[PDB]
Design a binder for this molecule. Structure first.
Ligand SMILES: [Zn+2]
Lengths: 74, 117, 58, 183, 196, 84, 121
RNA sequence: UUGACCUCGGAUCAGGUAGGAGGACCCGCUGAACUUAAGCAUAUCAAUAAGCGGAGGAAAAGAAACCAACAGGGAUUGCCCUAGUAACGGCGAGUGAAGCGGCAACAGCUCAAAUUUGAAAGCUGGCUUCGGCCCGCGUUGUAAUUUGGAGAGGAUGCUUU
RNA sequence: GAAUCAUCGAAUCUUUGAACGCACAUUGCGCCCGCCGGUAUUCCGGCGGGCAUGCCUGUUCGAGCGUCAUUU
């Protein structure tokens, strides 16, 4: 059991003796991302999750980030 | 000269008609805002510099401050009536001055100026 | 790429952006040029019919 | 016209009155912190010439940088290293410019002018509201200060051909194979 | 033994260094300020020509506004601001110049005694830039000047001009050119004898 | 099964000493006394002074928690800082 | 089972709190007796859950409208009541700040503005 | 004893800001080796890839300490040719621009150095019925005027809001 | 006024994560303010708002024979 569960990325890649995740580097503020492996980036880019907030931005820009209510609404 | 990676820095021009129609719609949109106004500005007649091109004139950047004064056109009104001004250029000869002053009087004759508000 | 594959699988609408341009292609108002401007003609034959000059260059 | 007198005195900086002041200030700056703050500029004529005003939103910071080589030489200037260290400290502020204030055998001392883009005096003033825009985030990291414009060769002439628009942009332009439709 | 705070030690060691290191005559002339009697007489005249504060200027403008609804001479105030004052002494409009001894960048006033002496205006050097800011209704004033006073006290300024000249100016005349330093104590003397 | 301390739980939460009330209010002693006259704050008596504070004396005076909290939110306390 | 949103906007805050009171209690007793013979009770439970969600939305809506009427004169609004926009749209210069110009450039533009003209053919 | 001014700190005081993501394009730092020369080390690869820092819808550059030698041109940027030219080199492999000219697009400006001195005229706060009150910043300089193919000051008489 | 409808300007938004009271592999361990229920001013449990770092402007508090004035 060299590696344990990582809090941030959820993989079993957190080294137990060093307390550093080999996939994302959890104690570091930045997520680990190297350019010599494109395949590892398409496993973690924006778009591989659920888009809880980023998916609702484009509709708000379509209407000019409108604030208020429709006129004569109840 | 195929010594470096030419494949990763090759630019193709399939958008040449696409850029052309975009360029024409930019000129179209420029005259939409400036509707009675022309789409360009007045440029002076300028003599090409080197001995290879001494005998051909072209369009320069803007008129000399002395060229505006001889034609009776004020310097702080000239950019507002569509005349480009260049303070770097000098006359150095009466032939360059007389040719461009005559150009400004011809622009003055063809001009329709509208009264403020 | 992983972005676009998520949208196809999702039951969320594709936000269709209307064709809005920064600059209007035609003059507008109640001036003389706006009333006599032809939408289908181009700049040069519009200024031909007006009697004006569009380009002062060569 | 007190600053014209200061300009002539700053030119003469090995002379007796100024070398005395540069000696006693270097002793004081050595025993302070590396990236400490200055309530007033030590050279008010150089701060004024570089864009500093006595307005809320303008601060001055003093930095000590280690001098010497990196026989490899660090292509970043010591002013550019000084400017990068203020911005990483005062991450809410924008690096306007910097100037030399002192020297030693181990350290060089610089004073850096910072502008607060989130104050209301700054946003109201159209002479400095340009720095409020998001294009000017971390100018010292992109070589956009006077030191960076020098080290990037941003001058005009036959003497600065390779670097007058950016050498990486010029190298991309000169190494691009341009193929047209009707070749 | 006990440990002093860092800024306490630094500002105290700046005392000892200023009194130990021997100072060039440009900065050394600031160590010779005037006496208690001449300060009080100068500030007696100068308090009479204080500028108007923000309250009584706003009321004075309110005077002329409400009278316009329902004739002045030249105001005479003490002049301040470095570039304003040194512009006045360069144009020989100043009668008397009073310079603080504690401008934290000393270069802003280090040319002032020579410029006043070249131009012919008699000057003086006083303790406290805070004392000059009191006259000015600011926090600190690096320098003040007097240009013209009313005819009530043309004589009082003339006697003060002389008293500054024969009481301060012809007493520091030899010390303008001479260097500072030479305040070595018993510990410094024994240390220098051990080093030599 | 949880371990709970007798010092932290009981009458010590309810009643507070005069010195602790002054330190909490961050006011001087004459300022605290004057605010007691105006607001009608009263020292009162706890049931067990030893349970309120183990190190305590009968000469010492205690205070209730709620009226101290009223003095913490007093506009007079804000007015005292403005007048000072 | 279902409470229409039309009548909820009429009633005040205290009367809504009674409906909120009976709604979960009826849900709770239903859920106890739903674990045996979960038939049309299960359709009713769904009607209870939507009705609870509908009155909570109406209770919240009149609450912040009352808060916004309180804060219509003060400068600093609370964090939840402020509009979202984006991060960069919030740090963008204001419309009055980005449009204002120097006095020396206003004096120039007043007396020498861009005139309107045409050139004959 | 009192009260400054200067400097250094504290506060779960009020109001804000920075981190991370993305990185196709953009600005910097740092920086290889394989290959070629039928071996190979200068060179080349390459001021590239990998590594680090930092922005925007574009970025960057930009209104000459410019190019020119002409009858001169006239901020920046990009395309076409210049041109595989000049120039540099185990002068082998090779490397390799620019001015001019034709176009695309064009737009100019802000300070510092001046005494408003017959009046700090400037600005942040937070308290308001909001109409205008104080606090602070600031003379070690905040507004106005001015930025060298200029300008200021007087006089002068027309023309502008 | 149906809808596994469309639009979308108002809300809700658990634990984490730049991740922010401390710990984290436990639905644990602390402090300030307020509320509720169960014998309840003392006991227990739950809930609500808060409590990271660097920096800027202001507010307030403090230190320094650094330093000025103080017999009219
Ligand atoms: Zn991980």
């Amino acid at each position: 059991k060299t590696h344990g569960l990582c809090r941030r990325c959820g993989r079993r890649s957190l080294h137990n003796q060093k307390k550093v995740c080999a996939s994302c580097g959890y104690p570091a503020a930045k997520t680990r991302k190297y350019n010599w492996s494109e395949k590892a980036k398409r496993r973690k880019v924006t778009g591989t999750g659920r888009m809880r907030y980023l998916s609702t931005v484009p509709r708000r820009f379509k209407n000019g980030f409108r604030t208020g209510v429709p006129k004569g609404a109840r | 000269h195929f010594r470096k990676h030419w494949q990763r820095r090759v630019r193709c021009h399939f958008d040449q008609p696409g850029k052309k129609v975009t360029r024409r719609l930019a000129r179209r949109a420029k005259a939409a805002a400036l509707a009675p106004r022309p789409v360009d500005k007045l440029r002076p007649i300028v003599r090409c510099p080197t001995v290879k091109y001494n005998r051909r004139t072209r369009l320069g950047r803007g008129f000399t401050l002395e060229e505006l004064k001889a034609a009776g056109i004020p310097r702080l009104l000239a950019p507002t009536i569509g005349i480009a001004v260049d303070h770097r250029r000098k006359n150095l000869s009466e032939e360059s001055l007389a040719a461009n002053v005559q150009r400004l009087k011809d622009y003055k004759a063809r001009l329709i100026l509208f009264p403020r508000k | 790429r992983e972005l676009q594959k998520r949208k196809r699988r999702s039951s969320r609408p594709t936000i269709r952006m209307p064709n809005r341009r920064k600059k209007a292609l035609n003059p507008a108002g109640n001036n003389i040029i706006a009333k006599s401007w032809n939408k289908k003609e181009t700049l040069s034959q519009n200024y031909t019919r007006f009697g004006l000059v569009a380009k002062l260059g060569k | 016209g007190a600053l014209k007198y200061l300009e002539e005195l700053s030119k003469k900086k090995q002379s007796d009155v100024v070398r005395f002041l540069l000696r006693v200030r270097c002793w004081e700056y050595r025993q302070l912190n590396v990236i400490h703050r200055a309530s007033r500029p030590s050279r008010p004529d150089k701060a004024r010439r570089l864009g500093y005003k006595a307005k809320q939103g303008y601060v001055i910071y003093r930095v000590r940088v280690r001098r010497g080589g990196r026989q490899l030489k660090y292509q970043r200037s010591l002013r550019a290293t000084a400017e990068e260290r203020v911005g990483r400290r005062c991450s809410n502020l924008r690096v306007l410019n910097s100037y030399w204030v002192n020297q030693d055998s181990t350290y060089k001392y610089y004073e850096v002018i910072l502008v607060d883009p989130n104050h209301k005096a700054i946003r109201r003033d159209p002479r400095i509201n340009w720095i409020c825009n998001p294009v000017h985030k971390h100018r010292e990291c992109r070589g956009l200060t006077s030191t960076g414009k020098k080290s990037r060769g941003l001058n005009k002439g036959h003497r600065f051909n390779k670097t007058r628009a950016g050498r990486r942009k010029t190298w991309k332009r000169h190494n691009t194979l341009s193929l047209w439709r009707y070749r | 033994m006990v440990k002093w705070p860092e800024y306490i030690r630094l500002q105290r060691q700046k005392k000892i260094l200023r009194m130990r290191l021997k100072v060039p005559p440009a900065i050394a002339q600031f160590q010779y300020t005037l006496d208690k009697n001449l300060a009080a007489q100068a500030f007696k005249l100068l308090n009479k020509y204080r500028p108007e504060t923000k309250q009584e200027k706003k009321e004075r403008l309110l005077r002329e506004a409400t009278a316009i609804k329902e004739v002045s001479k030249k105001p005479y105030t003490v002049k301040y601001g470095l570039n304003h004052v040194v512009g006045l002494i360069e144009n020989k409009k100043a009668s008397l110049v009073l310079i603080a001894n504690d401008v934290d960048p000393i270069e802003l006033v280090v040319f002032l005694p020579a410029l006043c002496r070249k131009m012919g205006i008699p000057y003086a050097i006083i303790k406290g830039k805070a004392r000059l800011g009191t006259l000015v209704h600011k926090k600190t004033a690096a320098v003040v000047a007097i240009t013209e006073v009313r005819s009530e006290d043309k004589n009082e300024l003339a006697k003060l001009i002389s008293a500054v000249k024969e009481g301060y100016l012809e007493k520091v005349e030899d010390t303008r050119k001479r260097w500072g330093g030479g305040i070595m104590g018993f510990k410094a003397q024994k240390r220098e004898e051990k080093r030599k | 099964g949880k371990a709970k301390k007798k010092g932290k739980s009981g009458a010590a939460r309810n009643y507070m000493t005069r010195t602790q009330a002054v330190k909490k209010l961050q006011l001087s002693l004459p300022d605290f006394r004057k605010l007691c006259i105006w607001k009608g704050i009263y020292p009162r008596e706890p049931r067990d002074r030893r349970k309120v504070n183990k190190s305590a004396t009968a000469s010492t005076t205690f205070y209730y928690t709620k009226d101290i909290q009223y003095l913490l939110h007093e506009p007079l306390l804000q007015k005292f800082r403005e007048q000072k | 089972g279902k409470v229409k949103a039309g009548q909820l906007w009429s009633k005040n805050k205290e009367e809504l709190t009674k409906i909120l009171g009976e709604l979960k209690t009826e849900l709770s007793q239903l859920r106890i007796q739903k674990i045996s013979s979960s038939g049309a009770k299960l359709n009713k439970i769904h009607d209870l859950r939507k009705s609870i969600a509908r009155v909570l939305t109406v209770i919240n809506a009149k609450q912040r409208a009352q808060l916004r009427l309180f804060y219509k004169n003060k400068k600093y609004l609370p964090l939840d009541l402020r509009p979202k926009l984006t991060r960069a749209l919030r740090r963008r210069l204001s419309k009055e700040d980005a449009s204002r110009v120097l006095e020396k450039t206003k004096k120039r533009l007043t007396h020498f503005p861009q005139r309107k003209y045409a050139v004959k053919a």
